[PDB]
Symmetry: C3
Subunit: 145 residues, 3 copies
């Protein structure tokens, strides 16, 4: 089976064997999470969400509607995603922009992923990076400081 | 009335009709929150705080003493604010620096708002931006990467 | 004694007099926390962790295995740390990289601290900074925007 912490609010039944979901996580009903994932404390996971097997999501991350995470992905702490390029309060998109983080990619701590983004297989996103364009497979990207 | 999630700690009675406050939020007694707001999971809202109507605060945001949010503002996930330009542990300011986010402005995911800042009506702050100076009304600002 | 909020999960007994640990914090058993600390809501503190006296950790911060915080340090909200320079899901380091934040240093809101980093005594890290190199004692560092 899987481990859902008593201090998490997990509403999805679509959770793979070996997955751990930690304290103060919210997971909404339609989320799909594969096997042997680690969803660390203080994460939010919405409905139109697919997360593969062996995915690590460190603390303080939100996976919105329109975000897909493939197998073997690492997401660092306080990483953000997004599904709305020009957000205005109460102006709901007719269709959320999709992001996909492809198999084996890693996203460093506190990176910011713009909407509509593909990060290729086995890419490495530097800590604190702002990703405004697709990142090719196996590429190391970071923002110049 | 308003919706306070059972897994939130909301101590303020000053909350407008239609407002939703989600799991694992903390709202301290003197906070004022208007009507039809959405305070998403994992937010902290302090005492000397005014939030208008139709405000969206996405997950993982803290609204400190000295921060005012006007009507129709969008605040993206993991956005930070601040009320102390030269912070030192246990050195409490005599007066917190004030920030105001004016009506209809939007702040992108993981943006950082320095203390003493005005963001003008209907401004758009890019995801991951560091805002060290006021942003004029209706201006799109982002940090060069 | 110390104050552990009923809505925190604090598993460590190694907590100094006068320390406050707030709602929705997780503190694992081996963490050491000194006297008169303030661990604000939504923090995660791991096992191989030493935090000194009079330390302020604002909301939304994680202190990982391998991180030491000395006395009188201020850590701003949504700051990230890290102990793995080339993270890949399920590829556990044989030894976590160590970070030390030396006495009296301050780290601004939403800063990102790379692994293996020393921040010197009384340094000041700008809000949103990415710290990829040691910061000398008493130096003010920020990332060019
Ligand atoms: C991107 C990364 C993999 C690069 O490592 P690297 O290729 O060994 O690069 P180097 O350390 O040799 O740095 C090369 C240059 O890039 C800069 N740089 C490295 N990482 C950077 C980052 N994340 N953001 C901005 N600049 C960065 C360095 O300052 C250095 O600049 P210089 O040549 O002017 O001295 C690494 O720095 C990183 O960000 N890792 C992610 C860590 C993380 O978040 N892990 C999960 C949580 S623990
Ligand atoms: C700022 C923003 C509105 C700009 O959109 P835009 O005006 O269409 O700009 P473009 O996509 O045409 O990009 C123009 C340039 O600015 C850069 N840029 C855009 N947004 C940026 C950002 N947030 N930070 C740094 N650079 C950015 C692009 O890389 C591009 O560079 P180039 O000309 O060298 O190719 C948008 O990118 C953004 O950040 N939106 C906020 C999304 C968000 O956080 N929503 C809430 C959560 S879903
Ligand atoms: C770094 C800091 C201490 C510098 O303050 P300062 O020395 O008075 O510097 P100034 O305000 O005079 O700014 C000098 C320049 O650096 C830039 N700058 C200042 N802080 C910056 C930051 N954090 N990131 C990027 N640039 C910054 C300014 O835009 C200004 O640029 P300019 O000369 O082109 O106009 C302050 O800006 C800061 O970041 N404080 C931390 C606030 C915080 O996070 N507190 C805890 C939460 S409330
Ligand atoms: C800083 C960082 O992200 N480093 C990671 C990287 O090196 C990576 C390759 O391995 C580790 O990440 P994992 O999440 O896979 O660690 P693991 O040892 O499987 O699980 C411990 C994590 O679980 C989460 N957790 C654990 C417990 C016991 C808890 O109560 N609440 C909880 O949220 C957070 C812990 O860091 C490291 O933490
Ligand atoms: C990524 C992003 O910020 N996009 C937003 C933007 O497009 C914006 C214009 O609309 C949406 O934001 P809202 O917060 O207004 O969404 P809404 O549909 O009103 O409410 C769903 C949000 O409520 C919060 N929520 C919801 C539930 C059911 C919950 O259990 N816990 C909870 O925290 C987080 C959800 O994303 C989008 O999420
Ligand atoms: C924006 C910022 O970090 N500014 C700080 C800086 O000026 C610094 C020098 O002083 C203050 O930080 P402290 O954390 O030391 O504030 P303090 O007055 O001791 O405690 C209030 C904080 O405690 C935390 N807290 C408090 C209560 C009552 C709670 O329910 N849940 C809780 O998480 C968050 C509050 O901001 C300021 O908040
Ligand atoms: Na819009
Ligand atoms: Na000070
Ligand atoms: Na590795």
């Amino acid at each position: 089976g899987h481990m859902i912490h008593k201090l998490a609010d997990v509403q999805s039944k679509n959770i793979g064997s070996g997955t751990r979901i930690w304290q103060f996580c919210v997971v909404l009903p339609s989320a799909i999470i594969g096997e042997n994932c680690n969803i660390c404390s203080h994460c939010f996971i919405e409905n139109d969400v697919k997360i593969g097997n062996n995915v690590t999501i460190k603390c303080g991350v939100q996976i919105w509607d329109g975000i897909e995470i493939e197998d073997d992905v690492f997401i660092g702490p306080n990483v953000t995603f997004c599904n709305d390029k020009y957000p205005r309060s109460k102006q709901y998109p007719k269709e959320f922009s999709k992001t996909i983080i492809k198999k084996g990619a890693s996203i460093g701590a506190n990176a910011t992923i713009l909407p509509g983004i593909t990060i290729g297989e086995n890419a490495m996103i530097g800590a604190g990076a702002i990703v405004t364009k697709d990142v090719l497979p196996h590429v190391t990207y970071y923002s110049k400081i």
